[PDB]
């Protein structure tokens, strides 16, 4: 047979699903493990039969278990069942999203939230800058990127954005479709304001003296919207 470790794991999973199906036949309401295993084993068998596509199986995994077939609390615990199955065209990942609908009141890990909003970046004044993507490719910018050093294809008044980042939720992003034009809010970067990396445009302390060096470097490297005055005077370290 030359079974691999994967084949042994999948055989164990198939028989866990078989046990789940037997218990469902006996009239027992399935718990979390049984529901997960039943969905996974059904998907594997369907993929072995070779008569359905992976997308069909993603849709079919959601009709196996009605809400009355599982215990209270089960539906809210199974966000997604992923299972890798071998189709005639090879191994594909099938994920079933929210296979079971909630019918009871039990929610394990239920979150009870205050209805008050969170104020982020408190004490930081936000300026508004209009930005246009003159390139032919999409550009996405995160919350803590130094906005002065974004893709050179974005065009905006770079001088007003020095030492600033997007005033959005941490870990979120703003997208710029090709040709898209929109305005964004920028707050000052906090901490020591020591900007290293990102395009190597600053790589030092952020201040008015280093803003001139950054503007000159940006203009030399073709960053759009950069207007650094001609007759630039170099410093001893650039």
């Amino acid at each position: 047979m030359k079974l691999t470790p994967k084949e042994l794991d999948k055989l164990m999973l198939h028989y866990a699903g078989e046990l789940a199906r037997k218990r469902k036949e006996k009239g027992i309401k399935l718990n979390y493990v049984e529901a997960v295993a039943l969905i996974s084993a059904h998907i594997m068998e369907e993929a072995r039969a070779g008569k359905k596509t992976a997308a069909e199986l993603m849709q079919e995994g959601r009709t196996l278990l009605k809400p009355d077939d599982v215990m209270d609390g089960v539906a809210s615990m199974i966000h997604e069942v992923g299972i890798e199955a071998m189709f005639p065209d090879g191994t594909k990942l099938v994920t079933v999203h929210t296979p079971i609908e909630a019918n009871g009141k039990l929610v394990p890990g239920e979150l009870f939230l205050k209805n008050e909003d969170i104020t982020i970046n408190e004490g930081k004044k936000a300026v508004s800058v209009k930005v246009k993507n003159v390139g032919d490719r999409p550009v996405q910018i995160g919350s803590h990127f130094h906005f002065f050093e974004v893709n050179r294809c974005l065009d905006f008044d770079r001088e007003k954005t020095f030492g600033k980042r997007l005033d959005i939720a941490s870990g979120t992003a703003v997208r710029f479709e090709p040709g898209e034009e929109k305005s964004v809010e920028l707050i000052d970067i906090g901490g020591n304001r020591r900007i290293f990396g990102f395009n190597a445009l600053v790589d030092r302390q952020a201040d008015n003296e280093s803003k001139k060096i950054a503007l000159h470097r940006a203009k030399e490297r073709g960053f759009h919207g950069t207007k650094s005055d001609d007759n630039y005077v170099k410093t001893i370290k650039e």
Binding site: N192, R194, R204, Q205, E209, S210, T235
Partner: protein, 569 residues
């Protein structure tokens, strides 16, 4: 459950929460913010008192039993002003809190256990601060070290080889051999020591060799030539080795003005000495760099506080050290561009505003090594007299101002020179460098110095007297100051590179040898209670100083506190 009047309670155990105490003869009022004690369980030592076998000394102590405990101490630190017991174990601060015996008392944690191995030090009615840190030492004479020790300073950072003319001008220990000389001489003293190398060169190999030879940083001094090239090279090497750079800028504007120097610094961390410029610096506008993010601005004590005698004294002092002549107009022009009572007046207010962050000495090089702390508190007292109570205060006290000025010589210099994990504050885990003050003498004359967890200096009467109090009383070396005990109580700070190469074993050093760290990634925002950045403009003609568009000045004082009430000379 019994009621005790506040008066007798304070007489027995010191002030408690809500009580206020005057600091010295000043107008600064300290309020106790919190108390770690359980009322009725205080630690007292004496005949018939609590600190006895089976009551407050444990007969079954924990394994983290203390070597030394300071009972009922009022801690004045940048972390707060509060009452606690301080436990010392193995030269470190082991615990801050209740302290006592878990067999007979409720709130005692294992790190504050008093057992048979613990020595008792009474601190009721006394103040405990961290040892002072002086970062502008000219190592001109060894006699400076006992003088600074008796004033409350426990760490001296600087450079020099002795009364040589290069040292009389600069805090520089130049080269590997001179570093070895000073590191082996350091074994004598009761003081934490670290040495600055010569930064005034454009040779990178020469700069790197001094760091690997044991220096904790560079001094750039105009007497060796403060040029942009040397500044740039020294900063590059310091960034590669994680050591601090201190600068005494070009007063003559020979290679450039203050903005050229800032361009050479190029936004890297720099510690500026005597930033107001009476001690040297771009005339007349070196003081403007005190608003920059990457600058750690320090002042030297001769200019604070500003008094009626300050200007004439500094003028005559300058005429002497530089051998100037009053009949030469060029020497007068140099002197007038240098002193500037305007910047001297502005310096006090900038200390009050938190623009200046460090106070230092410039010892025997226009500065007084035994007066850093005293002049800091004189400046605080003068500022409170002129501008009143700070608006950042919370209550009828001066706690915020006390923390702001105390940080100037304890925690901010330690952060600046990368030693704030060892010294600088009364915190658990740190080296037990502590100073005991009676509040009546706070800021001018301490009670005793604890060095490395052992008593090294104290007020003491004559050896033949029946008790330690009778006259004459002066500061005498204690047991941690002598024999092989001083090697355990004292640290020689070196660079990480020198430490990794076994500088201790190569030079046969018996003191503790510790590396400095985190010197290059700190800015003005890393100074406690002194992190105010602002745009500072100086008028080229009138020498007036404007902070954020508003003129900043102070008026001179005809009399200061903590001066003639406390000293015979």
């Amino acid at each position: 459950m019994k009621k005790i009047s506040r008066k007798e309670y304070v007489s027995m155990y010191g002030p408690t929460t809500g009580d206020k105490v005057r600091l010295g003869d000043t107008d600064l009022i300290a309020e106790v913010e919190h108390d770690y004690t359980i009322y009725g369980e205080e630690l007292k030592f004496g005949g018939g008192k609590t600190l006895r076998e089976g009551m407050s000394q444990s007969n079954n102590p924990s394994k983290e039993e203390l070597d030394l405990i300071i009972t009922n101490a009022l801690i004045v630190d940048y972390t707060g002003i509060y009452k606690a017991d301080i436990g010392i174990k193995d030269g470190k601060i082991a615990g801050i809190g209740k302290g006592g015996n878990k067999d007979m008392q409720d709130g005692v944690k294992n790190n504050l256990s008093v057992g048979p191995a613990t020595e008792a030090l009474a601190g009721e009615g006394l103040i405990v601060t961290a040892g002072g840190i002086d970062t502008h030492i000219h190592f001109i004479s060894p006699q400076q070290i006992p003088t600074a020790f008796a004033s409350g300073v426990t760490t001296m950072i600087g450079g020099g080889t002795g009364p040589a003319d290069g040292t009389n001008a600069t805090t520089i220990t130049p080269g590997r051999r001179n570093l070895k000389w000073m590191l082996r001489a350091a074994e004598e003293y009761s003081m934490n020591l670290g040495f600055l190398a010569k930064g005034n060169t454009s040779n990178d190999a020469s700069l790197a060799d001094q760091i690997e030879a044991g220096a904790i940083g560079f001094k750039i001094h105009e007497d060796w030539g403060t040029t942009p090239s040397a500044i740039n090279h020294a900063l590059d090497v310091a960034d590669k080795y994680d050591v601090q750079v201190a600068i005494h800028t070009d007063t003559l504007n020979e290679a450039g003005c203050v903005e050229d120097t800032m361009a050479a610094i190029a936004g890297r961390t720099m510690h500026t000495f005597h930033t107001e410029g009476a001690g040297g610096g771009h005339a007349p506008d070196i003081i403007k760099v005190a608003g920059e993010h990457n600058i750690l601005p320090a002042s030297t004590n001769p200019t604070i506080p500003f008094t009626v005698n300050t200007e004439a004294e500094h003028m005559d002092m300058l005429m002497v050290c530089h051998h100037l002549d009053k009949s030469i107009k060029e020497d007068v022009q140099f002197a007038d561009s240098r002193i500037r009572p305007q910047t001297i007046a502005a310096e006090d207010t900038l200390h009050d505003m938190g623009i200046f962050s460090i106070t230092s000495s410039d010892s025997q090089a226009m500065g007084r090594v035994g007066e850093v702390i005293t002049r800091t508190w004189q400046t605080a007292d003068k500022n409170k007299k002129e501008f009143g109570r700070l608006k950042e205060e919370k209550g009828d006290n001066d706690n915020f101002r006390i923390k702001r000025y105390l940080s100037k010589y304890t925690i901010n210099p330690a952060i600046a020179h990368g030693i704030s994990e060892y010294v600088g504050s009364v915190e658990v885990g740190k080296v037990a460098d502590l100073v005991l003050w009676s509040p009546a003498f706070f800021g001018v004359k301490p009670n005793m110095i604890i060095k490395g967890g052992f008593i090294a200096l104290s007020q003491m009467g004559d050896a033949n007297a029946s008790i330690p109090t009778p006259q004459p009383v002066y500061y005498r070396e204690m047991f941690a100051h002598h024999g092989k005990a001083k090697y355990d109580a004292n640290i020689t700070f070196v660079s990480q590179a020198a430490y990794d190469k076994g500088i201790k074993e190569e030079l046969g050093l018996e003191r503790q040898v510790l590396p400095v760290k985190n010197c290059r990634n700190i800015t003005k925002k890393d100074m406690q209670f002194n992190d105010t950045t602002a745009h500072i403009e100086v008028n080229p003609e009138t020498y007036h100083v404007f902070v954020d568009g508003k003129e900043v000045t102070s008026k001179p004082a005809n009399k200061v506190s903590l001066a003639q009430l406390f000293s015979i000379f």
